[PDB]
Design a protein around this nucleic acid. Structure first.
Ligand SMILES: [Cl-]
Ligand SMILES: [Cl-]
Ligand SMILES: [K+]
Ligand SMILES: [K+]
Ligand SMILES: [Mn+2]
Ligand SMILES: [Mn+2]
Ligand SMILES: [Mn+2]
Ligand SMILES: [Mn+2]
Ligand SMILES: [Mn+2]
Ligand SMILES: [Mn+2]
Ligand SMILES: [Mn+2]
Ligand SMILES: [Mn+2]
Ligand SMILES: [Mn+2]
Ligand SMILES: [Mn+2]
Ligand SMILES: [Mn+2]
Ligand SMILES: [Mn+2]
Ligand SMILES: [Mn+2]
Ligand SMILES: [Mn+2]
Ligand SMILES: [Mn+2]
Ligand SMILES: [Mn+2]
Ligand SMILES: [Mn+2]
Ligand SMILES: [Mn+2]
Ligand SMILES: [Mn+2]
Ligand SMILES: [Mn+2]
Ligand SMILES: [Mn+2]
Ligand SMILES: [Mn+2]
Ligand SMILES: [Mn+2]
Ligand SMILES: [Mn+2]
Ligand SMILES: [Mn+2]
Ligand SMILES: [Mn+2]
Ligand SMILES: [Mn+2]
Ligand SMILES: [Mn+2]
Ligand SMILES: [Mn+2]
Ligand SMILES: [Mn+2]
Ligand SMILES: [Mn+2]
Ligand SMILES: [Mn+2]
Ligand SMILES: [Mn+2]
Lengths: 98, 96, 111, 87, 114, 97, 81, 97
DNA sequence: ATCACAATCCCGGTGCCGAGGCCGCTCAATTGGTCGTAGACAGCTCTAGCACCGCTTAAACGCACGTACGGATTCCGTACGTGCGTTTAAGCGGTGCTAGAGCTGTCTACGACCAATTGAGCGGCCTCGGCACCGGGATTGTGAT
DNA sequence: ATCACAATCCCGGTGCCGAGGCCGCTCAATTGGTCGTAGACAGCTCTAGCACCGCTTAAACGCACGTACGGAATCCGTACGTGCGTTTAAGCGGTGCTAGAGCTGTCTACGACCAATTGAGCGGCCTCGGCACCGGGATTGTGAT
C-alpha cells in the first residue's frame, strides 16, 4: 500500500485552501444554524438569501483569522497542535474575552 | 477679566450624586472623568441614531432612534434599565 | 413645571441636550421625545456609576469619589467594563490581579 | 400555516471537516480533538452577536425580512466591516 | 444671451469621479450646515486616486492569474500585498477574497534530498 | 414592470479601469467590492471632516477639512499622493470658473 | 533633543511592568519597550500636531491630544472633550 | 546578615504599584521625548502642560495593558519571565504589528 | 542517491451565461440669480508657556554576588493524522404558493423658525473640613537557624 | 521547630488647599405664534422567500493502525533579582520675559436657496467571448529502497 507520513496531507490541504476563496462550511447547515439562532431572538423572521451569504462570508473570515492567531499561540508555546487554550489566549488578547 | 463660558454636566452629576450617596462628595478630576463619560455616551447614542435615521431615509431623530441606538450600544441589563428610564421619562413628559 | 427636566422627572438638562442634538450634525430634525429619552439614559448611566463609585469610596474609608473609585467601580462591573472597554480613566490605575503561577509555593508542608 | 419543523442542535452541522478546512485556510497543520467544540462555541457567540444587531435593524425598519444591509450594518458596528453586499 | 453648453464640474476639475454627486452626498449627509465648492472636488479626486491605485494592482493580479477580468480574489491579492492599502483596509473583509498563501516556517517538513 | 433607481460608482470605476488597464474587465462582485470601498472611504473622510469643522467651531466643510481628514486617515505615501491629486483638482477647478 | 528615548529608564519600565502584574523581566525588554513607546507616541503626536496645524495654532492642546487618542481607539477621560 | 529571596520583592512591588494610580515615568524625561518626537512633524511647537500630562496618562495606561498581555504570552510558554517575543506576539494578535 | 507512484499542474476543447454595449426616458446636476451671514482678517489683551538658576534629596546607576529559571536533552505513552469502506444528507433543478417588500398618493401632526421674556447656570470669591502625611509602637511575614 | 527584623498595620496628630457653597450677572432655555413638509397610514403590485420532492454524488462518518507529538522528568549554566555605595538629575520654587491664544469688530466673498433647463446615468434588453469545467497527458515531490 501507499501511506503519506502524518503532516504531508495536512500541508497539501493548507496549500489548497489558501489558494481558493470558496466557502468551507456547507451552506444548508450554515443557513439552519442562522435561522435557529435568529428564531430564539425573534420568531417569524425571513432572510434574504444574500443576508445568509453575508453572515457566512463574515463568519468564515472571522474564524480563518482566529485560527491564524491561534496557530501563532500554539507555535509560541513550541507546539504544532492548536489547543483550546491557544484560542482562549488569542481571544483574550483580541479583547473578545475577559 | 471674566473667563469665556465653559459648559459642563457638573451641576447635574452632583444632583444625581446627592440622590444616590447624599453623604458623598467628588474630586475635581473625578468630575472631569464623569464629564468625559456623558460626552462619550452622548456621541455614541446620537451617532447610532443618526445612522439609523439615514439607513431608513428619515430626516428626524425620534425617541425611537434613541431607544434602538441604546439597544445597539448598551449591554443586556444596562439596556433594559436604560430603555425603562427613557420610556418612563417620555411618558411622564407627554402627560405633563 | 416650566423646565422640560421637571416635566420629565429628570435632574439632567433636557433643553441643553435638545440644543446639542440640533447643533450636532446628526439629522435635519430632532423630535421632542428624543432629548427626554437621551437625557434620561445619560442620568441613569451617571447614577449607576456614581452608586458603584460611592460604594468604592466608603469601602476605602473616603467621603469623596476620586478617579480610582470610578476605575474600581467600572472594571469590577461586567456591563460597565464592556461599555467602557476602549476607555482610559486618567489616574485610575488597574485592579489588583496577580496570576496564580507568580505566587510563592505557600512554604507547603508545616510551619 | 404548515409551520416549518422545529430547529434543534444545528450547531452540529458545523462538522469536524468544515472546521478542519477553516483551520487549513488559517495555516493550521495539527488540531487537538477539543478544538471542534471550542470552535462551535466561539462561532455561536459571533453569530448570536451579529444576528442580534441585524434583527435590531430589521425591527427598527418594521420588516420581518433580515436584509443583507442589516447584516452589513451589524458587521460594521462590531468592527467587522464587510465589502461586497451593499457597503 | 445664450447661457449653456453644459460643462460638468468633473471636466472643470479634470476628474472621472462625479463632483456633482459628491457635493450632493455631502449636503445630504448631515456633516455640516454648509459645504464649500472645493470640498467635493478634493474628495472626488481622492476617491479617484485610491480607485486608480487598487485597480492598477488588481489588474496586475488578474493578468498574473491569466484572466482578463478582475475578481474579488484579485482585489484581495492587490490589497493584502500592499503595505499601505493593507493598513488602510486592515479592518475590512473582502467577500470571496480568501487569504495570502502563508505557512509558518516551523510547520514545513525537516531537511531532505540534497 | 417598473424600475427603482439605485446609484452606484460603477461607470467611474469602469472609466478609471479603462485608463489604467485598457483591456481588463471586472466581475459584478468585484464591482460590488469597489462600490463598498468608495462608500467606506467617503464616510471616513466626511466624518473626520465633520469633526474637524465642529472642533474648530466652523459651520463649513472646505477642501482644507478634506485635506486634514486625508492626512489623518491615509497612511504615508498614500496620503502624499492623495493630497497632490486633491490640491491639483481644486487649483484646476478654481481656474475653470 | 538628542537620544531622549533613554530618559525612559530601566527602573521606570520595571514599574510599568509591575503595575501590569509582571514578576520577572528579560534584559532585552527595556529596548523593546522603548521601541514600542516611541511608535505609540509618534502615532498619537503626529495626529495631535495635525489638529494643531488645522486650528492654525502653534500650541498643542490637551484637546488636540484627546482627539488624537480618540482616532487611535485609545479614548482618554479626564482632559476634556 | 539576611536578604529577601529573588521574586519576593517583585511581588511586593506588584502589590504596591497595582494599589496606586501615580504616574511611574519621571515627568521631565517624558516631556523631552514628547518635544523631541513633535519636532520631526513641526518645529517651534508649544504644549499646554495638561497636553503633555494627557500623553503621559495615555502612554503609561497603554504600556501597563501591553505588559498584562505580554505577561499572559510569557505564562502561555510556561515561563514567568517576559521576553521581546512575548511583546511581539501580543502586538501581532492586538493587530498593531 | 535512485527508483515507482500518487497528486498536482497544465493544456486545449466545450458550451454557457453574465459582462458590457446600445438605447431611450427621466431625474438630478447645472445655469443663473438673489440674499444674509461665516469667517478672514486686523487689532488688542493678558494668559500660561518657557528659560533660567540654586538647593535638596530621592531616584538612577553600576557593580558584586548567588538563586532559580530557562533551555537543552532524554523518554515514554497515546492523541492525532491517514486511509478504508459505509453511511448520510447536501446540492440541484423543479414546481407551487403568497407574504411582505416596497412603491404611490393623501394629508395633518409635529418640528423649524422666530421674537420676547427671565431664571438656570456660569464665573468670582471665600473658607474650613477631608485627607495626605507623619511617627509612635503593635503584630505579621520572610528567611536564617 | 525558634528568632530576628523589616514590613505592615493602625492610631491620633497636624497643616494644607480645593470642594463646595453664596452671590449677581447674563445668555440660553422657555413661551406662544407661524408655516411647511415628513412621515403615518391606507391601498396596490409583484418580487423573492419558502416548502416539498427525488435523485445523484460527494462529503461525512467510524474505525484500524501507527508514529510523531506533547509533556513529564532531569540536569547545567548564567541571566536576572537583590542590595550596597556612589552619582545624577528630577522636582521644587521663585523670578523674569513674551508668544500667541482667544476674544472683538468690521465687510464681503461665498454658499444656501430658488427657477428653468437638459444630458448624465439610470434600467431594460440583448449577445457572444471569458472562463469554469473537463479529461488526459507531463511533471513534480514523497516515501521506499
Ligand atoms: Cl421624539
Ligand atoms: Cl472649499
Ligand atoms: K498663553
Ligand atoms: K419579496
Ligand atoms: Mn496602465
Ligand atoms: Mn486553457
Ligand atoms: Mn442572460
Ligand atoms: Mn450590467
Ligand atoms: Mn444615450
Ligand atoms: Mn446635467
Ligand atoms: Mn451662482
Ligand atoms: Mn463671526
Ligand atoms: Mn525550569
Ligand atoms: Mn432550487
Ligand atoms: Mn398582503
Ligand atoms: Mn408594509
Ligand atoms: Mn409643536
Ligand atoms: Mn461655579
Ligand atoms: Mn515606629
Ligand atoms: Mn495592630
Ligand atoms: Mn486617623
Ligand atoms: Mn468649584
Ligand atoms: Mn442665585
Ligand atoms: Mn430659562
Ligand atoms: Mn414623503
Ligand atoms: Mn464503519
Ligand atoms: Mn517533542
Ligand atoms: Mn524635592
Ligand atoms: Mn516650577
Ligand atoms: Mn505679539
Ligand atoms: Mn492670532
Ligand atoms: Mn473675505
Ligand atoms: Mn445600466
Ligand atoms: Mn457583446
Ligand atoms: Mn464562442
Ligand atoms: Mn459556466
Ligand atoms: Mn480533471
Amino acid at each position: 500500500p501507499h501511506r503519506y507520513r502524518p503532516g504531508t496531507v495536512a500541508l497539501r490541504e493548507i496549500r489548497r485552501y489558501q489558494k481558493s476563496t470558496e466557502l468551507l462550511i456547507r451552506k444548508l447547515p450554515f443557513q439552519r444554524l442562522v435561522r435557529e439562532i435568529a428564531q430564539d431572538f425573534k420568531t417569524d423572521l425571513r432572510f434574504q438569501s444574500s443576508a445568509v451569504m453575508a453572515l457566512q462570508e463574515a463568519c468564515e473570515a472571522y474564524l480563518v483569522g482566529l485560527f491564524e492567531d491561534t496557530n501563532l499561540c500554539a507555535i509560541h508555546a513550541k507546539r504544532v497542535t492548536i489547543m483550546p487554550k491557544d484560542i482562549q489566549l488569542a481571544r483574550r488578547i483580541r479583547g473578545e474575552r475577559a | 477679566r471674566k473667563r469665556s463660558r465653559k459648559e459642563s454636566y457638573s451641576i447635574y452629576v452632583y444632583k444625581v450624586l446627592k440622590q444616590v450617596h447624599p453623604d458623598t462628595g467628588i474630586s475635581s478630576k473625578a468630575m472631569g472623568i464623569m464629564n468625559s463619560f456623558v460626552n462619550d455616551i452622548f456621541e455614541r447614542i446620537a451617532g447610532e441614531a443618526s445612522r439609523l435615521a439615514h439607513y431608513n431615509k428619515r430626516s428626524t431623530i425620534t425617541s425611537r432612534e434613541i431607544q434602538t441606538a441604546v439597544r445597539l450600544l448598551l449591554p443586556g441589563e444596562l439596556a433594559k434599565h436604560a430603555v425603562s428610564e427613557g420610556t418612563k421619562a417620555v411618558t411622564k413628559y407627554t402627560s405633563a | 413645571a416650566k423646565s422640560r427636566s421637571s416635566r420629565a422627572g429628570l435632574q439632567f438638562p433636557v433643553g441643553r441636550v435638545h440644543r446639542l442634538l440640533r447643533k450636532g450634525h446628526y439629522a435635519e430634525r430632532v423630535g421632542a421625545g428624543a432629548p427626554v429619552y437621551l437625557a434620561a439614559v445619560l442620568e441613569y448611566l451617571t447614577a449607576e456609576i456614581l452608586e458603584l463609585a460611592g460604594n468604592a469610596a466608603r469601602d476605602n474609608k473616603k467621603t469623596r469619589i476620586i478617579p480610582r473609585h470610578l476605575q474600581l467601580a467600572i472594571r469590577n462591573d461586567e456591563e460597565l467594563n464592556k461599555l467602557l472597554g476602549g476607555v482610559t480613566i486618567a489616574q485610575g490605575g488597574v485592579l489588583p490581579n496577580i496570576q496564580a503561577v507568580l505566587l510563592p509555593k505557600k512554604t507547603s508542608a508545616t510551619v | 400555516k404548515r409551520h416549518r419543523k422545529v430547529l434543534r442542535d444545528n450547531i452540529q452541522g458545523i462538522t469536524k471537516p468544515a472546521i478542519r478546512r477553516l483551520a487549513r485556510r488559517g495555516g493550521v497543520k495539527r488540531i487537538s480533538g477539543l478544538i471542534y467544540e471550542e470552535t462551535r462555541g466561539v462561532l455561536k457567540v459571533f453569530l448570536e452577536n451579529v444576528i442580534r444587531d441585524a434583527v435590531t435593524y430589521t425591527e427598527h425598519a418594521k420588516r420581518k425580512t433580515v436584509t443583507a444591509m442589516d447584516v452589513v450594518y451589524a458587521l460594521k458596528r462590531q468592527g467587522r466591516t464587510l465589502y461586497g453586499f451593499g457597503g
